[PDB]
Amino acid sequence: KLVRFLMKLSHETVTIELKNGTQVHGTITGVDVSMNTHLKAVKMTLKNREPVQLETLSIRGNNIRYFILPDSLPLDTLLV
């Protein structure tokens, strides 16, 4: 239910916070049933270190704290 919600966020740009508080900014390319998330055009910021630019990043769903969703996402229509 909520897993699908994530699965419809392909091509979003989001900021993902990891359990270590690393901050991953990027564009979603796919999210799978376990919330493993694949991004492109990535800016990864470790706490208190300059950010690393990356073409792609894949993140383990269990390594994720939350997704900072886009401001203009239509929450209602995603949740039919």
Partner: protein, 74 residues
């Protein structure tokens, strides 16, 4: 229920919720949707600072979710 009923009620009342998480994090906002695992879609979130308009939270952070309604009168 434990927290599942705090949340179903919170969605019903559109009422603010204090989400107390893992390592001393707190999130304050409105629960849109939530599942059995305490995964949540949240709006108008104050992180304890930082404001977040819309957020998807994973359940396994969550220790306790407390209600924080607005009440008229003494």
């Amino acid at each position: 229920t434990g927290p599942l009923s705090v949340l179903t009620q919170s969605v019903k009342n559109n009422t603010q919720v204090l989400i107390n998480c893992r390592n001393n994090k707190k999130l304050l906002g409105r629960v849109k949707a939530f599942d059995r695992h305490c995964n949540m879609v949240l709006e108008n979130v104050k992180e304890m600072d930082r404001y977040i308009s819309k957020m998807f939270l994973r359940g396994d952070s969550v220790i306790v979710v407390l209600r924080n309604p607005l009440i008229a009168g003494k």
